[PDB]
Assembly symmetry: D2
Homo-oligomer: 166 residues x 4
């Protein structure tokens, strides 16, 4: 004999999930992709191709590059790790790209950096990988153990969570 397929590709675009301390900045910067650290110890049957697109906390040019990389990917199952502050805008933009029509594209990340104690990151990565493999084609946000429709979602700062727009 069997060959394990690798149907999921992951793109990383920085965000809180990848933040790490630097002595020079005397605080957090966007560091290496934390999803690579989670998948290293996941004992995967197959593998996951992880490609770093950008390392920002994020411009219109950056958004455009993400659409191109996702659209040019061979895989039909895609996970994009990203900051939560701009996740709805990125997700809605990807939603409007005809070339994504047959792909399941999930955005996720973490409210707490993976490299800070008490982070949601590893759970979110596991949930978002499953989501990207199991959901019908579309663009989704997977956070809080839930799937969100980008056109009907906002980040509620007071809650500290994404919430649906009724």
């Amino acid at each position: 004999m069997a060959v394990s397929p690798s149907p999921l590709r992951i793109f990383t675009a920085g965000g809180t999930i990848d933040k790490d301390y630097r002595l020079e900045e005397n605080g957090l910067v966007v560091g290496d992709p934390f999803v690579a650290e989670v998948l290293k110890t996941a004992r995967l049957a197959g593998a996951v191709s992880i490609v770093a697109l950008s390392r920002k906390d994020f411009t219109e040019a950056d958004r455009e590059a993400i659409g191109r990389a996702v659209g040019q990917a061979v895989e039909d199952h895609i996970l994009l790790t990203h900051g939560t502050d701009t996740m709805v805008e990125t997700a809605r933009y990807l939603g409007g790209l005809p070339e994504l029509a047959g792909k399941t594209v999930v955005l996720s990340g973490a409210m707490v950096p993976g490299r800070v104690g008490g982070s949601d990151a590893a759970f979110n990565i596991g949930f978002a990988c499953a989501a990207a493999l199991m959901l019908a084609p579309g663009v989704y946000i997977a956070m809080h153990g839930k799937v969100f429709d980008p056109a009907k979602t906002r980040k509620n700062r007071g809650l500290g969570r994404f919430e649906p727009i009724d």
Copy 2:
């Protein structure tokens, strides 16, 4: 829809005890993972057993089947030892009582309280599997969904594999 989580012990929950000079099955690790998961939805955890999975009898499996049957929830995650996860999953897949439920078994090759554990990833993956898969019994391990009737644990590889 509401997820119900049942804990049957196993490697995922193992923790060090001075008295034993080694690992024992401790408190359920899934509770530690979900505490920091910032969940939006309805979830509840129920402790069933703190055995090592090798020590399960026909009667431990019988009791697990009836316990899962007591849950009105249609989405079920059962955390369990990998050594007899296929036997429990096959047993549950044979119970007509459970046929409308999505039941996902998962756990970890390395205890969650040991460095470098698969446990958190596996819990996130299995929670999504329990919510997204059609009714049936499944093993969710290694970033994959296994059909219990067509799966074995391969000790040489340290993974479940298809038959």
Copy 3:
């Protein structure tokens, strides 16, 4: 049976060692004292009284309060957890207080927050506790597995370490 003594008192004055992520700030703040977390699992024979003096990354009034608390303590073995950026100035100020004459006073902390992966904090706390119990009376900085004389020490940003002044 015997009664275990508690000869060490710890005062906390914030600093990098205690920094923790907050969703509201979208970055690090000075959080709860990390030394309390290290001592919780240290399986101490006796105990350590830990008193929080301040939570700053730090004014002249704050420096004065530290001198008062250290001087009024019953214990002759004192550990002050603190930011590294102002540690030499605090240490030199404590050095000039006659009321500290019979006390062993050690300042320490961490170049990386205790709640960030790959932190020096737990090692530094163990080393600094021993230092505060074992050194002769005086004021010291314990970092990098070494004891520094405050009057002959500077923080070298390029090295990322304290270094002696030759």
Copy 4:
């Protein structure tokens, strides 16, 4: 002055192995702690043994004594199992060859690779003890310095205590 660290295994270094379905003595945990300690001074680590301390013979202790004697350094940390740390420390305290050295034995009640371990604190404490104490053999555990000839492990308390 230069510290030399010798590793003799024990609980501090235990790690989970799929093949054993449990803990084995693994790679020395002191190396993991010192990697992130941002040390200023001269330190070197030497592996002596990967036994569980219960399994030490008169000959394992003999070999440890001669190995510590091979170090020109006067400041020595030996990481070790707690179950026979008093026997090794008493043995070393009887060797005239070592009488100019400060030799500190330490370890952990909980493996460093298990959550909630004393190991990192104990390593920092013991490094300072090895640098600061007068020549002699000492156990540094529980934020305290023990005289080996006047110490026992109390299994009821889970700590070393004075006699």
